[PDB]
Amino acid sequence: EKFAFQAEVNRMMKLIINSLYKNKEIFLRELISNASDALDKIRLISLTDENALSGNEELTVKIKCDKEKNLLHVTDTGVGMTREELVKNLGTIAKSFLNKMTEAQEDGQSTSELIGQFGVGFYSAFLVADKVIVTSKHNNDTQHIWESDSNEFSVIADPRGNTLGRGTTITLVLKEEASDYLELDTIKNLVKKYSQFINFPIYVWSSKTVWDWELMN
Numbered sequence: 123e124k125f126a127f128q129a130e131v132n133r134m135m136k137l138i139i140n141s142l143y144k145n146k147e148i149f150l151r152e153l154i155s156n157a158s159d160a161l162d163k164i165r166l167i168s169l170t171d172e173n174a175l176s177g178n179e180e181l182t183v184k185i186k187c188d189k190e191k192n193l194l195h196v197t198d199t200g201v202g203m204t205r206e207e208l209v210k211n212l213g214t215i216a217k218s219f220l221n222k223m224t225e226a227q228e229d230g231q232s233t234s235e236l237i238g239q240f241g242v243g244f245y246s247a248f249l250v251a252d253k254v255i256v257t258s259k260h261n262n263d264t265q266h267i268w269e270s271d272s273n274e275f276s277v278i279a280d281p282r283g284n285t286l287g288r289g290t291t292i293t294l295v296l297k298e299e300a301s302d303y304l305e306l307d308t309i310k311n312l313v314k315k316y317s318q319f320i321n322f323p324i325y326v327w328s329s330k331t332v333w334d335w336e337l338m339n
């Protein structure tokens with residue numbers, strides 16, 4: 123159940139952290155960017171599979187804050203990940219760079235748009251999270267759970283059964299010095315800055331006292 127990151131992924135994580143060390147808020151931009159790519163992925167698949175959305179009819183990205191439990195949730199109803207995809211897509215490299223990141227970093231150029239361009243921004247979550255939990259269900263597999271603290275990662279079958287229907291949930295156990303992102307006004311502002319150009323609706327579980335979703339894009 124326990125795996126070690128591929129060495130190249132260990133290096134990529136450090137390069138992404140050092141590049142976005144001064145602008146940690148970018149992690150939420152990438153999580154949104156990733157959630158869109160997953161939704162964009164299942165929508166293309168729906169053009170060829172009439173039952174690709176049977177597990178879940180909505181195509182949304184929903185965000186929840188839990189100040190009491192110190193958690194931040196980013197859920198998308200996209201294509202999702204199988205057990206094998208949780209291990210390979212997150213633990214190794216398998217798409218399409220390291221010299222370019224080093225060259226831009228060594229020659230002192232900016233790389234924020236470079237990480238979001240290749241879609242490796244998932245690891246920027248470790249800028250604000252002590253642990254990253256990924257719950258995902260793919261139409262061709264059962265719902266699994268992926269956990270990591272940047273030192274290793276594990277995958278287990280979700281004992282709660284099929285809860286998501288289809289999609290992924292990125293759960294971040296925010297650090298002690300990242301509780302600023304537990305407040306609502308800061309999250310809603312950050313979400314709106316990065317979710318305008320996403321072709322899918324973005325909801326945030328806010329309060330007013332009753333609670334409900336709030337559209338941001």
Ligand SMILES: CN(C)c1ncnc2nc[nH]c12
Nearest residue numbers: 156157160198200202244290
């Ligand atoms: C992390 N990664 C590459 C992902 N793969 C598939 N669906 C996702 N939804 C959010 N991130 C996702």
